[PDB]
Amino acid sequence: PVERILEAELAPNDPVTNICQAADKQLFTLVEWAKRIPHFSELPLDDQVILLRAGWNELLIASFSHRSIAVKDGILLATGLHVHRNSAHSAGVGAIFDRVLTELVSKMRDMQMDKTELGCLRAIVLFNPDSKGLSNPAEVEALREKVYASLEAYCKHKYPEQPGRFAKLLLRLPALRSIGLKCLEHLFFFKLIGDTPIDTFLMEMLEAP
Amino acid sequence: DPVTNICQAADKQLFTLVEWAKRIPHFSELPLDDQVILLRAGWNELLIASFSHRSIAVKDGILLATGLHVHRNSAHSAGVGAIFDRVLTELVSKMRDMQMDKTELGCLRAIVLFNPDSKGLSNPAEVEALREKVYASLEAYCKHKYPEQPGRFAKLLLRLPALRSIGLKCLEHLFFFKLIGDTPIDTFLMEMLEAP
Amino acid sequence: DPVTNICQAADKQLFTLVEWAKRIPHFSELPLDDQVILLRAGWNELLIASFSHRSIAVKDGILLATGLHVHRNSAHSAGVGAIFDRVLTELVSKMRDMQMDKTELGCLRAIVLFNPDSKGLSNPAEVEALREKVYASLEAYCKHKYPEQPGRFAKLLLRLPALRSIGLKCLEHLFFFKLIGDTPIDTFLMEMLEAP
Amino acid sequence: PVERILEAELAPNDPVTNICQAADKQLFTLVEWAKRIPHFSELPLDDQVILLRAGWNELLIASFSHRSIAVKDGILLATGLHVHRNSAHSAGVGAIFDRVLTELVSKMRDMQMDKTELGCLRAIVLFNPDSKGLSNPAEVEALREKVYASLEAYCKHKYPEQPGRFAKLLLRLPALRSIGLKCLEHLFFFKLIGDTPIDTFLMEMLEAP
Ligand SMILES: CC1=C(CCc2nnn[nH]2)c2cc(F)ccc2/C1=C\c1ccc(C(C)C)cc1
Ligand SMILES: CC1=C(CCc2nnn[nH]2)c2cc(F)ccc2/C1=C\c1ccc(C(C)C)cc1
């Protein structure tokens, strides 16, 4: 149900604890979104955990990448923190930042990917049948197939002048995959929201006696 | 000697790859530097896609293009069991179960080759345009060979994220060295130590 | 909850680390930005050095700073047995065998902290100068405390390459996540999924 | 023993095959050097192989780093090939290359590390008792200890005005270790000697029918 996926999408100083709380909040947002995706909650809870663990990075990146179409040559996080290249280059994650801009954000803008298409792609990512430890990979594959079947129908209806649009959307996923991998190994997300609170906390303690 | 054999095999494989790309429609029409960049960016995934599909008739193993067979027990022995299992489960077994044919493999490899995200491309838009012509043709193919499988085309495209990450994990784990280079290097070094 | 405990423990460890550095001679005299760079560049090796030395009275395991004990059986379960064994064999057991004392550990940690190769340092030469004063002090210590062991000072310094690569490998294998974060995250996610 | 360590130091298109032969030559130079190191050849042959496998990268880097003391912002190879920073940045290995320059070449230059000192440091690297699979780790440690004992005596004799020189040499090894690791994971060596022959072979074949 493409209508159901679109409604899912729409709906002091102790630095490490503060960062974890932000991660907590963002993770919960993802869980709530997944629950609104049709049939996800019908999967075993152990399978739901595995899918979220396998997908959380790509799912987060896809979100703030699409959110950043409106913003100006930077990345808009959910927290409202507008991060520019130099903040990313200062954090030691400039390379990833450029790829996110080039391979995802810019491309989404150029093709004007909408929230329904974004939602479907993330549902496809969520329904990842290659996730290790699944009790029943086949039903996960089945749910993913229902999603892109629905996405394709949506594209041919809303954009009949673009017959290659559906495949174009799908072929952003390899970039999302590779960028996802780089983010986990550089602690991209936790560096971006964490560098300032840590440096600030550091400065205060070093200046104090 | 095993080391020279591997290096020769690489050269032959590289020759075969370059000849293959030149027979892909409109590849040679791209600027030469762009042709090089694409081949530079793609050789790993192109190679993995090739031996994965080649290994469909193999049980619990892979076939490298010169009758070189590697079993998973050996793969786990060499410390790359995890990435090896990923090749088996995410690529080989999926290719087997849906019976991906050589025409389908060819199109998917052409899509991999026509990678507009490759850094340094002078005309990324032209590369993207050629990719679109490739997957349009692949969709047309799937529709007529398997009309009863409307999701087949998308299902093919959705192996590419797996190929991408497997390719990356392979390089980071020295996949090929640990599987085919490890023992020849011991032999190599022993021979050097045998020198006067 | 298991997760909050870890972040709270992390904050405390970070607090302890900063205070330790501030009591290192001439550390607070460095420019503030350089102090931050040094603490950022060094915290991993500094922390690893600490719990390694703490774990000398433990067999086949490590003691993390809040009574948190991890045995090698658990580490292999979590998929980080190799790096864990390196910590055991290259650091802990070596610290045990030469009976490295806390003064020697302190100096080595001070040397790690005063890292002149740290990128972005405003005055690398002053950092190097402070490092030299530290290892001059450590040599004097080794000479007079253990005169019958003339190679001891060098033996201490030559654990630093092992510390360096282990620090790098720990981060690349998500060592700490896999040992103390993995299971709490499953519990965490389950709690979220069972929520209204 | 230090005199022998100094004497050890003193003494048409198939691109991959051509790269392998170059690697072959360079590796053998290292093996021949190790054989002249006292007591090395007395170790079991399986242990010698293990030590060379564990050390070959660091041993090579130390060599061309020290050789590059005379040159400006580049690396001088055994083949006589002068590789510059920007040529390395073009190959996608700019970050490591600079680290080699800053943390090794420059440091070797500033303290005027001599070939005896280089030779001793490489012997220390070679005699790595942490190498996995050694039949007798203790005798390797024993050999390493004999080396740095000899190196220290050499430093205090030749440079009595520099009492911290010996420790200064030893404390380049953590940097050598970390740079060594980065080189294995970026295919540093095989990119440096390999990028040009491959691009050439590609261009000529793509130009051909
Ligand atoms: C890239 C690469 C390394 C460099 C290190 C590496 N990177 N990723 N995996 N290994 C290596 C090292 C070796 F020893 C042997 C092979 C290789 C190799 C590639 C390769 C793959 C398959 C084949 C078959 C056609 C025979 C030949 C060469
Ligand atoms: C850096 C880090 C990650 C980030 C990922 C990582 N990097 N390297 N290893 N893991 C992580 C994730 C977790 F889940 C749990 C811990 C950690 C962690 C470090 C750490 C170590 C000890 C303690 C106290 C017990 C003293 C707290 C935090």
Swiss-Prot record, chains A, D:
Residues 99-119 are annotated as: Required for nuclear export. Residues 1-209 form the NR LBD domain. Expressed in lung fibroblasts (at protein level). Expressed in monocytes. Highly expressed in liver, also found in kidney and brain. It is found in: Nucleus; Cytoplasm; Mitochondrion. Induction: Down-regulated by aging. Induced by pulsatile shear stress. 9-cis-retinoate binds at R67, A78. All-trans-retinoate binds at R67, A78. Acetylated by EP300; acetylation enhances DNA binding and transcriptional activity. Composed of three domains: a modulating N-terminal domain (AF1 domain), a DNA-binding domain and a C-terminal ligand-binding domain (AF2 domain). Belongs to the nuclear hormone receptor family. NR2 subfamily. Receptor for retinoic acid that acts as a transcription factor. Forms homo- or heterodimers with retinoic acid receptors (RARs) and binds to target response elements in response to their ligands, all-trans or 9-cis retinoic acid, to regulate gene expression in various biological processes. The RAR/RXR heterodimers bind to the retinoic acid response elements (RARE) composed of tandem 5'-AGGTCA-3' sites known as DR1-DR5 to regulate transcription. The high affinity ligand for retinoid X receptors (RXRs) is 9-cis retinoic acid. Homodimer. Heterodimer (via C-terminus) with RARA; required for ligand-dependent retinoic acid receptor transcriptional activity; association with RARA is enhanced by pulsatile shear stress. Heterodimer with PPARA (via the leucine-like zipper in the LBD); the interaction is required for PPARA transcriptional activity. Heterodimerizes with PPARG. Heterodimerizes (via NR LBD) with RARB. Heterodimerizes with NR1H4; the heterodimerization enhances the binding affinity for LXXLL motifs from coactivators. Interacts with NCOA3 and NCOA6 coactivators. Interacts with coactivator FAM120B. This is Retinoic acid receptor RXR-alpha. It comes from Homo sapiens. The gene is RXRA. The chain holds residues 231 to 458 of 462 of the full protein.
